Every structure is written in structure tokens, then in C-alpha cells.
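Input record (Table S2, row 323):
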Amino acid sequence: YRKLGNSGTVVTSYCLGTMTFGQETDEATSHLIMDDYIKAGGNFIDTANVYSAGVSEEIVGRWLKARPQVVVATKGRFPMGAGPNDLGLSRTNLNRALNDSLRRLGVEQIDLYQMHAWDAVTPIEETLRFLDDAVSAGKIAYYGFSNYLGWQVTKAVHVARANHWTAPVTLQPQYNLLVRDIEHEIVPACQDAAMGLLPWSPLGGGWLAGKYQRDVMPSGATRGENPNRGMRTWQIIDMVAEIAKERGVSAAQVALAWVVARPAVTAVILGARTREQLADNLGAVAVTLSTEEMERLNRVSAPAMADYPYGERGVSQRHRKMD
Ligand SMILES: [Cl-]
Ligand code: NA
Ligand code: NA
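Output record (sodium ion complex):
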């Protein structure tokens, strides 16, 4: 399935993460995971400059040289060195940060440029003005955010609208059956601005895929190096598993098919480290959960909150009954 990312550019329902392409996966296995992804019919690569110190981008860049169209996304904001202006949404750092993602990807235009995180030190106006100048220059097509809060998305959107700049297209949050707190302020804020979600960590870092042996709950390997903030967790993993094998499919596969069908979601980022793991994740394309499986999964992962701003009672009093 093809969707837009709040713009005219369409993109396939699954996105290829490339975090692994320097740390764990080597460049040859990276090229073949990408070759598989394409051959499965994807057109969406997500990378970052800080992924393996930009090696991640260079492998993607070399693979684009070998292959002769794909929608490419990358990010800024995080430390590329240990200096004080080697991080930040300042236009000084972002200016070289975009030039270096450009030379490392060997493209002349990045399709999606993303702020990897909010930056309280840079005024948002400076950042958005830098991104609009980049759009005018043909260095980037669109921009979006990752790890912005709700009110922060809302302030950016309207500040862009106030200065006749382009609108943000996407938000890249962490979102899976275990990590659903973006539904209180961040999702409402994107839906209000017609924006699309790009969820990453859809297997919750492994907790949802099984592959363990009824593990210990504070095991730091699968997640965070703490193993339970939201990674009850065991009930969710269990429900996912039951639905998994009655449908004759992997537990990973119905968790993936759960994220792809949630409101506002344009494309899920896949963290395949292997060719086989890519095949195991892309099996979820065939799975389409029924309205019931999903409303099941929804309520068992429903993030309960202290009553006032984001739990039952505050929600209920913000609601307006039509009657
Ligand atoms: Cl997009
Ligand atoms: Na769409
Ligand atoms: Na779907």
C-alpha cells in the first residue's frame, strides 16, 4: 500500500531503517537488505547522520550509486563531534550538517530532512528559516521532526504558516503496542496539522517479536538499557502472540501490522539487521488485522494515566456530547 507523507510524494507502507548499517550490519549485507527491500517493492529509506557516524548514510549513498526512484530521508540535530556547535538546530551546525549528509549520500536533493530532536537552545524561527532557505536552494524537498513534543509541533506548524514557509510533512516518533504515549498530545497535534507519523521501533526493540524464552522483565538488552518503563507489558506481548499463531503468522508480524493500521500513520520504519529478518518483517504486509483483533490490541495496550490531563476523567470532560 502507498500513502502520502502530508505532501504529494507517495511512499510505501513500510520504510527501511538503516540504523544498523554501520554498527552491526556490514556494507555488503546492507546493500543486499536494500536490494531485498526494493525487490519487495518499497521506495522509502530512513537514515541519520549520527547513525554510525554517517557511515550509515555513505552505504546508502554508495548503493544509490550502484543502482540507477527511491524516497530518501535523513536527520540532523545530534552530535557529529564533541564540540559545542557539532550538535543543535542552529543554522550554523545544520548548514554543515546538511552539506555533509548531502555529500555522504551523493544526492543533490534530500527528499525528507528531519530534525532528530527538539532543541530548546535554538529558537524555532531560526531553524524553520534555515529549512525554508534549504527548500528554496533545492538542497531538500520537505522537512519534518522526530522527538518533538505536541505543543512543539503545534508551535512550529503555525510559525511556519505565519512566515509563508512550507509546512512540516511528518513526525518520526517511537510508537508500538508498548510505547503509546504519543497519543495524548503528539498525535492530536499532527492530525490537526494533517501531518503523517513515521513510527520507528515497532517491535518495541524485540519485546514484541518474541525470539526469547519467557525472559526476565528487567532485561536491558531488549528495548532502553532499563527494560521496563513501557518497554502490563506481558499481557500485551501475550495477546500479540495468541493472535499471531491463530492467524498462522509471527508475533512480530501482527505487531507490525498493528502499527501500520493505526490513525495518522504513513510508514513504519523496519530495523532489519539481516536479509532473513527483512523477510520476517515484510511478511506483515500480507497480514491485515481485522477490526476486532485491533480493538482488542488497542484496549490491552491502552495507556492508563493519572486521571487529570490525559486519563478517563479529563478526557471525558473535554469531550462534547452532541446531545
Ligand atoms: Cl513523506
Ligand atoms: Na495517503
Ligand atoms: Na494498514
